[PDB]
Amino acid sequence: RAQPASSVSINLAARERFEQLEASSGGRLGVAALRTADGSYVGYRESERFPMCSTFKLLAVALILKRSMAERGLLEERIRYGDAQVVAHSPVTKRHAGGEGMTVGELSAAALQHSDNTAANLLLTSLGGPEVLNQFALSIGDTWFDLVRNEPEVNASVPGDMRDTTSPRAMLLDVQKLLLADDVLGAREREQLKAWMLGNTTGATRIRAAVPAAGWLVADNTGSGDYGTANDVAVVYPPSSAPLVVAIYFTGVTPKETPPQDAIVDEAARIVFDALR
């Protein structure tokens, strides 16, 4: 797509800042960000593969929402599961194992608002597994998304492992297509997906931490993993402005036990907001 002349210059200036941040970081940084009003854009390693961690759950919930347009009551279907299926970082689903279960819509909310790993797994199984989700990615024009495992193994983020990866640009394009265009999801479904992502509670140290002033909203999707891995993909709603789309992936710090480098994602988002101001 086209961009204003200013965007070409600003992207070069942003790239120098991203290079310096990455050089300090111990790892590898990937960014794609778009100002939808005019097409201004910044990219850094935008077509490299990064571990998705649980950011795959955006496509999983989107596919279920697409199917719910024809399958009435899909979101009300109840799924039951045992304690043995409750994996790490499952703050909602751990309360409803056994006879009670959760509906598909409740699982979608838990996955998108609390990064509930078991919820993501249950939705992935419900839709038909990783290969079916990859086919959905391809159907929306995403040739990079490549899910192989489920949680917690997807979060392993081993440096050099290309399984369970996507690119920042591919995810940016997916966020735009699923939330800001009408070719995949209907208007009510886009609104529900947006409402779930606006209510995410796991993003306070990432893109949300970088917003420059009060009055901004962020509809995001985080992922976290081993080797310092911290990701955040979002639509950002600035005051009196058309939306921005921001996809940040960061990974690859040894040792394995390095915690997600949220502060790097925060700073990358600050560079983005400066470039797109």
* Active-site residue set: 54
Report d(CA 219, CA 26) in Å as an integer: 28
Is 183 within 8 Å of 46 (Cβ atoms)? no
Residue 201 CB: number of other CB atoms within 10 A? 11
The C-alpha angle 164, 54, 155, rounded to 5 degrees, equals 60
Cβ-in-10-Å burial (0-12, 13-18, 19+) of 121 comes to buried
Report d(CA 148, CA 163) in Å as an integer: 6
Report d(CA 275, CA 151) in Å as an integer: 35
H helix intervals, the chain: 5-25, 57-68, 104-114, 117-127, 130-139, 168-179, 187-198, 262-275
Taking CA atoms, 176 is separated from 24, 105, 196, 245, in Å, by 30, 22, 16, 7
Among residues 249, 261, 242, 247, the alpha carbon closest in space to that of 26 is found at: 261
